[PDB]
Design a protein around this ligand. Structure first.
Ligand code: CLA
Ligand code: CLA
Ligand code: CLA
Ligand code: CLA
Ligand code: CLA
Ligand code: CLA
Ligand code: CLA
Ligand code: CLA
Ligand SMILES: CC1=C(C#C/C(C)=C/C=C/C(C)=C/C=C/C=C(C)/C=C/C=C(C)/C=C/[C@@]23O[C@]2(C)C[C@@H](O)CC3(C)C)C(C)(C)C[C@H](O)C1
Ligand SMILES: CC1=C(C/C=C(\C)CCC[C@H](C)CCC[C@H](C)CCCC(C)C)C(=O)c2ccccc2C1=O
Ligand code: SF4
Ligand code: SF4
Ligand code: SF4
Lengths: 645, 70, 185, 194, 86
């Protein structure tokens, strides 16, 4: 019965002759998670969320298992300066060169921040992660097959959901983590930094340990508690306690009696909630990426440069992807709602908002890339004093160089964070602003021109994802909100690539500058980024071509895998070009000739070979483009930062 | 089924009288014929074939490293 | 101030092109020699062994990593001994593949035959399944007993295929299949 | 309802009704329902015959020496290495001719038992002895052949793997100072602390 | 003006009429199909060229054919909304 319905999609695919094509298979994959509007839509969504939680628990259990069995975590504990490796590679083919793979996910620093000192603890965490994944799968099953409809959670029970998330989940989790810190993560780090052995973590919950050995509640303990690797954990514990208190207090001191989803259908309500949630998660990922190197929070984290770079770049990419998906699902919710009258002011200011954003994007692009091209031209013409640099026309970011304010018992973050900015920082920040504005322009245009436009006046009848409306009106390709998300994903790729390039070059420049020695204290400019990141040629020479030596000379070394992934990423990126530049009709005719060749030999497949649909071709091209570009940057960054740091 | 529940539900109808001592097995009513049919799907069958071929190649490479007998 | 290395042509004004029959064999070619006495190949093997030993020295004696690198070293030694019979140039030392057609060490005829048999097996198994399952349902839903029957029965593809080709059951008449005649031929 | 005589906790498998070894009706997995029984019986008979000849060869090879020149190794596994190339080619040619003329080219699972009266495992080598006798006696002889075939299949597998574990000849079983087989080499998921 | 044509294979579906976003196709009586009606395009000047009519035609090939004529673009064929040429 249930097993029969497991392949029910395939049975329906083969039931009708119209669905006996490869296009039907691609539609079956594309419409996999597109849970259609029905009485059980909310059940399906919640069960899918719980299943994903189980999948993430499987991933966490696997990571802890690798830390327990296939990692040098104990050696890293004895010497944090060593390379953290947590992936053994068996001797198959000839891959033995890369047998220890330096993991840059920061799990060693995280576990040290959690008070984990024995691989047995990692084994226990892996086992409990598998147990939690099993429980999540059981719950997802149950909710999909036997539970409440959940249709009231976004409109009727939204107050209960929001209040529970505010108090229970968020506040109680922060409070519990503060307790964990104060009780086992601070004392274990104390006894590790002091090198006085670590007892069982439960023995710290004895009321006879340092909890009552001394009642002094400041920075004074046995011998000399002057460990500065330990203070970030103290600050984290204080932050979590304060955050739990403020969340609990403000939740009961908040109205929360305003649900803007009364006017939206359940499917559109789910899509809008997903969009806003994706926006919040993406901006949180970007904020964490900035704060990871802005503020030290994990033990021996800043010392491990590949880990810092990987965390920053990964979370920037995830934030960009989720920010794009936010507008994607906002567009889906708007176009799939029967009466989305809520966005009346913005659908009636469609052209005003879009055109002002268009001017903003045009202005930012011309100005930023013209500063860059002007510097390129002046340096080429031998006119370094006409460039935009510190030794020339100076675009000093004055608004950056001021945070002075009345003290009122504060410190540290009352300034520009102790870093001086120059013309290169100004220009690259404006490049970032322009690229972000262009991505937002594409996404907002897709949202606004989703139900109707001056070109096509019934785009809401065409749903969210359609290839075009036809070659009429001069041509109407790529008008769909899906196609706007498709272009916004390219522009997000461009924006985040430039952002991570800026971060990586600044990071390497700072590492080289702090490698002055000790006596060298006039860094002049030096600061390879600050001196060279003012030209497109400067980038192309001193960042891409300069750092590519590590990734292209990695053959025969443990980074040969990074070199091979570099090549494979280029290959996938050019294959994307193949998919993006070409069109469905040609490939259909080529498949017609190939299918004649098949029929000539009595082969005759019945699932009729159809080339990828227009939207499917665009999606495949975009997937390959993102994979190739992100993989190239991944291989390049990792090889450069592991070989040189 | 007046209460809106999803298709293929192992849930008893929530509109019941006083507490019932009834047996409501929460396990999927799967079928051996259905399971065999599902594992015979083109994705499942061909991914299993690909896994078998890949593992066979892995073992051949392990026990006969490189092309020593060329 | 000099140009690229100038090569010397044969001013073949004799009116005949002489092909030496004794030079139609790998052993008679002056630019490739067996890997056993190729000094460059031996140097490559020595460098590989030295690098493997250097990698091994990082890990202490008796550790699992030491044993892994030791097995890698043994594999490299056995591979070198096997490759000593190959043909590897005179200045590169990298073993070559001889695609002339001579049955030699590192040749192509035997690998070509093995691959062609295997993939004719694959194609004939697929074609037999499609012929005995003329249905999209059985294409999306693989009939595993029948599929494996065809797969294990395609071992006789080279002879069955030729019999069908010569008996007209393999190819299809051009007037019975969907052929492109939209130009109204 | 009906249950298999051999396996009382499993259903009685069909397609084993009229067959030589079908009275014990042993088929738990149930390849009977999936495959043609004629092909399964032909394969079982061929495996049994091949393995009986293989068993007597494996036992008697270190005895009956070899071809003038080759040294039949005591451990019969190395006889493939000690075999001349001409001997291997002759063996391959003989096996190919014997197994390809036996079915007139219908030597495949799709075409072997498609003609009509292809009796499973009846290649015509002395079938006249069964042409006489009395049904029950002929079926008894066929059952003797089947049971010996199964026994020799398992026995030859055991001989090969005994020569693998001992790394020696078959007959000097459990050499002096055995103390159990050597632990298996090469890595695994449990070798790298799985 | 993108020329739009109707051929004998039309079977009076009226789907091409319902698919037109500018009221180009129109159903005339005829004695060639069982439906006793055949599409016609008397208002081709309004045809934008979207080929929605071709997407809705069930015949083996398009009984209604839209031939794009890029050298004869019109404000009605180009779908101009902010520019007037009349
Ligand atoms: C988060 C997901 C995830 C990922 C990406 C990996 C990835 C990997 N694991 Mg792994 N693992 C995971 C979760 C994960 N694991 C979990 C949850 C467990 C606990 C059950 C394990 C337990 C585990 C063991 C015990 C081993 C690996 C091994 C490996 C490596 C080779 C896998 C292999 O041989 O394929 C085999 C795949 C199959 C046979 C198909 C089934 C590879 C890096 C191996 C390794 O690192 O070797 C040195 C190894 O021995 N893993
Ligand atoms: C079409 C291109 C091509 C070709 C001809 C080969 C050929 C080969 N590769 Mg190779 N490879 C390729 C693409 C290719 N590869 C790609 C794209 C990559 C990147 C992922 C690699 C990566 C790669 C590695 C890393 C290794 C090889 C190795 C090998 C060799 C051993 C193969 C082997 O034993 O298989 C084992 C499988 C069989 C023998 C099949 C079983 C025999 C059949 C079933 C018999 C059938 C009945 C007759 C072989 C010469 C290995 C090597 O070094 O050898 C020199 C090796 O370690 N390859
Ligand atoms: C203190 C109780 C508590 C706790 C700890 C959680 C915790 C969680 N809920 Mg939740 N929930 C609660 C009460 C609680 N819920 C109540 C009372 C309701 C009914 C209104 C819901 C309805 C609900 C829905 C509908 C969903 C969650 C989801 C989630 C998960 C992700 C939340 C997120 O990212 O935002 C969102 C998280 C594990 C999400 C999830 O991942 O599902 C598993 C999700 O989609 N919850
Ligand atoms: C919380 C995260 C989240 C969730 C729950 C959803 C949920 C949904 N999205 Mg969505 N989306 C998200 C984030 C999310 N999205 C983000 C961040 C983006 C921007 C990138 C998008 C962009 C997007 C588009 C453009 C569309 C959706 C659509 C959908 C719906 C159907 C999805 C489907 O069938 O996919 C099925 C699953 C797949 C297709 C997965 C295939 C694998 C992908 C394509 C590539 C993965 C490559 C992998 C990472 C690399 C491989 C490893 C490598 C080493 C080889 C569903 C409601 C579709 C829709 O119609 O909505 C109604 C739709 O058209 N989304
Ligand atoms: C868009 C970015 C950009 C910017 C800001 C500059 C800036 C400059 N370039 Mg330059 N350049 C650029 C791109 C850019 N370049 C590119 C892409 C190239 C390659 C072709 C060059 C090639 C180039 C050369 C070859 C030379 C310069 C030179 C110069 C300098 C003098 C230019 C001049 O005469 O100004 C002209 C400025 C104006 C006419 C005014 C326009 C801006 C006004 C103020 C806008 C006001 C808008 C207003 C506020 C709207 C509101 C009004 C309302 C309130 C009423 C100046 C620093 C020269 C130099 O060496 O100087 C250092 C020079 O010889 N440039
Ligand atoms: C029954 C399976 C089958 C058979 C007999 C053939 C046979 C043929 N194909 Mg073909 N093909 C197949 C599947 C098959 N194809 C599939 C699944 C695809 C989609 C990827 C293609 C895509 C394809 C293209 C694009 C071309 C051919 C071409 C050809 C011809 C030249 C041989 C060649 O280049 O092969 C090369 C084969 C491939 C590149 C794709 C192989 C993909 C897999 C390995 C094949 C599937 C095997 C099947 C699943 C076995 C299942 C058995 C089981 C059900 C029992 C030849 C008539 C060429 C042609 O027309 O030349 C005249 C040509 O240009 N084919
Ligand atoms: C081991 C070697 C070997 C030998 C000696 C034979 C011998 C024979 N096979 Mg055979 N066969 C073999 C391997 C062998 N096969 C293999 C490996 C396969 C699987 C691909 C087959 C599949 C096969 C089929 C399907 C058929 C035969 C047939 C035959 C017979 C007719 C041969 C004939 O007249 O050709 C005369 C000489 C020919 C030289 C040229 C053959 C092509 C070469 C390679 C060029 C003959 C007894 C036929 C049998 O008909 O019924 C009696 C038949 O239909 N064979
Ligand atoms: C015809 C192909 C083939 C062959 C001859 C072998 C043979 C072998 N495999 Mg193997 N394997 C295969 C396919 C194959 N496997 C596939 C397709 C996979 C999954 C991708 C694996 C995964 C696998 C693992 C993870 C391990 C083996 C191991 C072994 C060896 C011990 C037997 C065992 O544990 O069973 C293997 C079990 C299965 C094939 C069942 C999978 C379901 C043995 C030499 C083990 C070994 O080396 O022990 C010393 C070992 O640890 N294999
Ligand atoms: C059919 C026919 C004919 C014929 C015939 C022929 C050739 C008939 C041949 C029958 C034949 C040859 C039957 C062999 C059985 C071998 C068995 C059962 C093996 C047992 C082996 C067993 C049970 C186990 C052995 C162990 O090894 C194991 C597993 C582990 C070791 O540590 C210990 C030992 C050693 C104990 C005619 C008459 C010639 C002409 C007629 O026209 C047609
Ligand atoms: C190539 C191409 C096709 C043809 C693509 C098809 C027919 C998809 C089928 C490709 C098969 C499924 C590839 C299978 C995977 C490959 C064998 C590679 C992956 C596995 C290897 C790495 C071993 C389109 O349909 C198309 C449509 C619209 C715009 C552009 C294009 C386009 O560029
Ligand atoms: S080119 Fe493709 S996407 Fe553009 S209008 Fe024509 S069919 Fe539509
Ligand atoms: S859809 Fe096609 S067949 Fe039907 S009436 Fe219109 S033109 Fe004629
Ligand atoms: S192309 Fe569009 S506007 Fe023109 S006739 Fe067809 S449906 Fe009407």
């Amino acid at each position: 019965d249930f097993s029969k319905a497991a392949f029910g999609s395939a049975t329906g695919l083969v039931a009708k002759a119209a669905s006996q094509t490869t296009t039907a298979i691609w539609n079956l994959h594309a419409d996999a998670h597109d849970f259609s509007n029905s009485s059980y839509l909310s059940k399906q969504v919640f069960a899918a969320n719980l299943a994903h939680i189980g999948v993430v628990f499987i991933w966490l259990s696997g990571m802890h298992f690798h830390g327990a069995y296939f990692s040098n975590y104990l050696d890293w504990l004895q010497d944090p300066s060593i390379a953290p490796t947590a992936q053994q590679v068996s001797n198959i083919a000839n891959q033995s060169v890369l047998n220890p793979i330096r993991v840059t996910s920061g799990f060693f620093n995280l576990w040290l921040a959690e008070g984990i000192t024995s691989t047995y603890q990692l084994k226990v965490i892996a086992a409990f992660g598998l147990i939690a994944s099993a429980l999540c799968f059981l719950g997802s099953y149950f909710h999909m097959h036997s539970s409440t409809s959940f249709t009231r959670v976004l409109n009727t029970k939204l107050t209960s959901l929001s209040t529970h998330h505010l108090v229970g989940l968020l506040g109680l989790g922060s409070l519990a983590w503060a307790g964990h810190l104060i009780h086992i993560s601070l004392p274990v780090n104390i006894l590790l930094n002091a090198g006085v052995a670590v007892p069982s973590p439960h023995s710290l919950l004895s009321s006879k340990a340092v909890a009552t050995i001394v009642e002094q509640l400041s920075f004074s303990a046995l011998t000399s508690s002057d460990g500065y690797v330990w203070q970030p954990l103290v600050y984290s514990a204080m932050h979590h306690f304060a955050l739990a208190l403020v969340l609990i207090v403000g939740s009961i001191f908040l109205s929360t009696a305003s649900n803007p989803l009364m006017s939206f259908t359940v499917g559109s309500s789910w899509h809008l909630v997903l969009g806003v949630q994706l926006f919040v998660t993406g901006t949180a990922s970007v904020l964490y990426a900035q704060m990871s190197n802005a503020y030290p929070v994990y033990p021996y984290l800043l010392t491990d440069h590949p880990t810092v770079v990987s965390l920053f770049v990964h979370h920037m990419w995830i934030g960009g992807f989720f920010l794009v998906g936010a507008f994607a699902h906002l567009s889906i919710g708007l176009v799939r709602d029967t009466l989305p009258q809520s966005f009346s002011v913005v659908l009636t200011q469609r052209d005003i908002i879009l055109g002002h954003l268009t001017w903003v994007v045009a202005f930012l692009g011309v100005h930023s890339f013209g500063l860059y091209v002007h510097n390129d031209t002046m340096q080429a013409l031998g006119r370094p004093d006409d460039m935009f640099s510190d030794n020339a026309i100076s675009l000093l970011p004055v608004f950056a160089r001021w945070s002075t304010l009345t003290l009122n018992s504060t410190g540290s973050a009352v300034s520009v964070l102790g870093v001086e900015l120059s013309t290169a920082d100004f220009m690259v920040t404006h490049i970032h602003a322009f690229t972000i504005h262009t991505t937002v322009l594409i996404l907002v245009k897709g949202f606004l021109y989703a139900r109707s436009s001056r070109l096509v006046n019934d785009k809401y009848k065409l749903d969210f994802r359609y290839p075009c409306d036809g070659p009429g009106r001069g041509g109407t390709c790529q008008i769909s909100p899906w196609d706007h998300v498709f272009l916004g994903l390219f522009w997000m790729y461009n924006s985040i690539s430039v952002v991570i390039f800026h971060f990586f070059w600044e990071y390497q420049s700072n590492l080289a500058s702090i490698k002055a020695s000790a006596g060298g204290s006039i860094r002049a400019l030096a600061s390879d980024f600050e001196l060279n990141s003012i030209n497109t040629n400067g980038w192309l020479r001193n960042f891409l071509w300069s750092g590519a030596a590590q990734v292209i000379q990695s053959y025969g070394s443990p980074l040969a895998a990074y070199g091979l992934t570099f090549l494979a990423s280029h290959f996938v990126w050019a294959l994307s070009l193949m998919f993006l530049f070409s069109g469905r009709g040609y490939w259909q005719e080529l498949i017609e000739s190939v299918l004649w060749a098949h029929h000539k030999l009595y082969v005759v497949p019945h699932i009729q070979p159809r080339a990828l649909s227009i939207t499917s071709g665009r999606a495949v091209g975009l997937t390959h483009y993102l994979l190739g570009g992100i993989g190239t940057t991944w291989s390049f960054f990792l090889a450069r930062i592991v070989a040189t740091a | 089924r007046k209460i809106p529940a999803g298709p293929y539900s192992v849930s008893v109808e929530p509109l019941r009288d006083g507490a019932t001592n009834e047996v409501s097995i929460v396990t999927p009513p799967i079928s051996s014929e259905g399971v065999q049919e599902y594992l015979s799907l083109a994705p499942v069958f061909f991914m299993a074939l690909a896994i078998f071929t890949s593992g066979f190649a892995i073992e051949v490479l392990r026990f006969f490293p490189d092309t020593r007998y060329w | 101030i000099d140009t690229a290395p100038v090569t010397k042509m044969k001013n073949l004004k004799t009116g005949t092109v002489e092909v030496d029959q004794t030079k139609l064999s790998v052993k008679s070619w002056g630019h490739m020699e067996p890997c056993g006495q190729n000094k460059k190949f031996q140097k490559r093997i020595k460098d590989e062994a030295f690098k493997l030993k250097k990698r091994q020295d990082k890990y202490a004696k008796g550790s699992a990593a030491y044993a892994g690198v030791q097995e890698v070293i043994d594999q490299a030694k056995d591979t070198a001994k096997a490759y000593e019979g190959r043909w590897c140039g005179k200045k590169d030392g990298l073993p070559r593949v001889i695609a002339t057609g001579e049955v030699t060490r590192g040749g192509i005829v035997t690998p070509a035959l093995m691959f062609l048999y295997t993939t004719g097996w694959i194609g004939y198994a697929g074609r037999s399944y499609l012929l005995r399952t003329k249905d999209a349902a059985k294409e999306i839903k693989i009939d595993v007993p029948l599929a494996l029957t065809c797969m294990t029965s395609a071992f006789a593809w080279p002879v069955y295929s030729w019999q069908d080709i010569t008996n007209g059951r393999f190819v299809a008449k051009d007037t019975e299949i969907r052929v492109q005649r939209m130009h109204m031929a | 309802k009906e249950t298999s005589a051999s396996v009382p906790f499993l259903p009685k498998p069909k397609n084993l009704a009229g067959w030589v070894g079908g009275e014990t009706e042993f088929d738990p997995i149930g390849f009977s329902n999936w495959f043609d029984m004629k092909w399964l019986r032909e394969a079982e008979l061929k495996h049994g015959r091949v393995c009986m000849m293989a068993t007597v060869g494996f036992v008697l090879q270190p005895y009956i020496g070899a071809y003038p020149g080759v040294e039949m190794p005591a451990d019969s596994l190395q006889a493939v290495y000690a075999a001349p190339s001409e001997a291997w080619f002759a063996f391959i040619f003989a096996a190919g001719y014997i197994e390809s003329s036996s079915y007139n080219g219908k030597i495949t699972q799709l075409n072997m038992f498609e003609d009509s009266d292809r009796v499973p495992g009846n290649l015509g080598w002395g079938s006249t002895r069964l042409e006489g006798m009395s049904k029950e006696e002929s079926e008894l002889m066929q059952l003797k052949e089947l049971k010996n075939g199964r026994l020799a299949m398992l026995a030859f597998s055991g001989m090969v793997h005994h020569n693998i574990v001992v790394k020696g000849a078959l007959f000097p079983l459990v050499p002096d100072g055995w103390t159990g087989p050597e632990p298996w080499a090469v890595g695994s998921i449990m070798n790298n602390m799985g | 003006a993108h020329a739009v044509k109707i051929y004998d294979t039309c079977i009076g579906c009226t789907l091409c009429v319902r698919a037109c976003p500018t009221d180009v196709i129109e159903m005339v009586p005829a004695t060639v199909n069982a439906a006793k009606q055949v599409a016609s395009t008397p208002r081709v000047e309004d045809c934008v060229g979207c080929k929605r009519c071709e997407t809705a035609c069930p015949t083996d090939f398009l009984s209604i054919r839209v031939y794009l004529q890029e050298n004869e673009e019109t404000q009605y064929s180009l779908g101009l909304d902010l520019a007037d040429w009349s």
